[PDB]
């Protein structure tokens, strides 16, 4: 019910998926003709209390 908690949830999820893609890259290191993957993140929306 707290904004900090609901932001840290997304942070944990992003770190988990980054670790997952790293593990997938490391798993098939001996696969012939395999191209490594990297993940790119972006920030979610913003709440404007006062209009800039």
């Amino acid at each position: 019910m707290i904004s900090s908690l609901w932001i840290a949830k997304t942070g944990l999820d992003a770190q988990q998926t980054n670790m997952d893609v790293i593990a997938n890259n490391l798993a098939n290191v001996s696969t012939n003709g395999f191209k490594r993957q990297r993940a790119v993140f972006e920030d979610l929306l913003y709440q404007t209390i006062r209009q800039p």
């Binding site: 209390i49 006062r50 209009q51 800039p52």
Partner: protein
């Protein structure tokens, strides 16, 4: 009471009473976001438009009253007394020395300690007066026997 509402047609209001600013009853655009400055300027931004399209649309009218020359009315809106009205004119002038802030809403000013002490004093005074009533009635009732023969 700073709680300002907006109607469907962009008309500002406070508890059904249209707030008047510089001019007449101020009306903002239809469905634009509204921002209040630190001194009463009203800025409107039509939603979806780029942020660099925010435009002033009106200005509030803020008056300064000392407090000892204003009386409450039946509806609940303070108005100037007769003498202060005569001295300062029928309608006050929007002085520029008053500054306000947005995002906050002012509550009421009632002192619980004062209320409790007043209630206790009222109850005790009522009891004393009742005792006086009883004593006077008893004295008169017994004195009327003198009238007999």
């Amino acid at each position: 009471n700073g709680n300002i509402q907006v109607g469907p047609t962009g008309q500002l209001t406070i508890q059904g009473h249209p707030v008047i600013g510089e001019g007449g009853p101020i009306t903002v655009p239809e469905g634009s976001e509204i921002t209040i400055a630190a001194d009463g300027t009203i800025s409107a931004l039509n939603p979806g438009d780029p942020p660099n399209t925010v435009a002033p649309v009106g200005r509030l009218k803020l008056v300064k009253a000392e407090g000892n020359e204003v009386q409450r009315s039946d509806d609940g809106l303070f108005r100037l007394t007769a003498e202060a009205q005569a001295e300062r004119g029928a309608v006050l002038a929007a002085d520029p020395s008053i500054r306000i802030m947005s995002g906050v809403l002012e509550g009421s000013n009632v002192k619980p300690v004062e209320a409790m002490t007043d209630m206790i004093a009222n109850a005790r005074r009522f009891e004393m007066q009742m005792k006086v009533i009883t004593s006077v009635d008893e004295n008169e009732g017994r004195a009327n026997q003198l009238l007999s023969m």
